């Protein structure tokens, strides 16, 4: 509830250049182009949008929802605009046009953790005819290496059995679809222990094939950080040793990262009486393609 703003003056509307501040929105609209309706609060696909009526967010902020709409695979085009408003906020409108889908007989999984991002990404159009649908038949081969080159999910086979009759009862797949396949296997993950995986993507390259892409949380550092005490940020020096055996084997990069294994540690670093607090924090790192820093942190007690 830290608020600021500074609207352009005033009633205007504005494209996405401006801002070193942090905005306040008081509405979002969320319009679907196509159908030429506007996705009511209380409709569930309107969560769809992260962006809270009364939040602060900052310019990298939404280019960020911006960013994350555009390569989910369920929106061949998606734009977000804002209105300023009389004072001090502004309204932010995100219009979208949904893919277009088939039928799809067959769903499939791939784990696209520490691989290239898709990017939504559509080379130039006209682009005479001929050349279009040899630009298409580059994509599609394009994929098939894709799907390849990708390492099994741990998706088990229940779930592909909920998400296919899910499918078949549809017959033809849209965005609201889905968001509900989303929806299931973030949650079978989450369940599960895999607290950072998240499905970055939908494929439709692949005829009467959903392809849903994954990253499951691969833990590419570790790292120890070490406070005293009141206090804080010093070496450990002589510590580092005694904190890394009591680290499970699979915190250790080259593994999935799972809340299991971080709760291991926790229990096992407890148990030398060292420290005040002890935290096994999971974030993203550097890459942006799905790689995981756990860092321990450990504050020392008085």
Known sequence: WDSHGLPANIVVQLNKLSGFKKYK?????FFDRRRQTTIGTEDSFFEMVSIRPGGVYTKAQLQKELETLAT????????????????????????????????????????????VQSKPIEMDSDMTDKEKLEYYRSLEKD?????????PCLLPAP???????????????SARL???????????????????AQVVNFGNLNTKEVVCEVVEGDITQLVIQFQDKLGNVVEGNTQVPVVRRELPKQLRQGYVFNIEAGK???????SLGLFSN?????????????????????KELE
């Open 25 to 29: 929105v008081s509405d979002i609209m």
């Open 72 to 115: 989910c695979g369920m929106f061949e085009k998606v734009d977000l605009e804002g209105k300023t408003k009389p004072d001090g906020t502004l309204g932010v409108t995100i219009s979208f046009a949904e893919s277009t889908w088939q039928s799809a007989d067959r769903f499939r999984c791939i784990n696209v953790g520490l691989m």
């Open 143 to 151: 994929y098939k290496r894709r799907i390849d080159r990708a390492r």
């Open 159 to 173: 779930v592909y059995g909920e998400v296919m009759q899910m499918l078949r009862d549809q017959g033809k797949v």
């Open 178 to 196: 889905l968001q509900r396949i989303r929806d299931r296997v973030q949650k079978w993950y989450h369940d599960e222990g895999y607290a950072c």
């Open 264 to 270: 291991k540690a926790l229990s096992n670093i407890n």
């Open 278 to 298: 002890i935290e096994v924090n999971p974030r993203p790192d550097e890459k942006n393609e799905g790689g995981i820093i756990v860092e321990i942190k450990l």
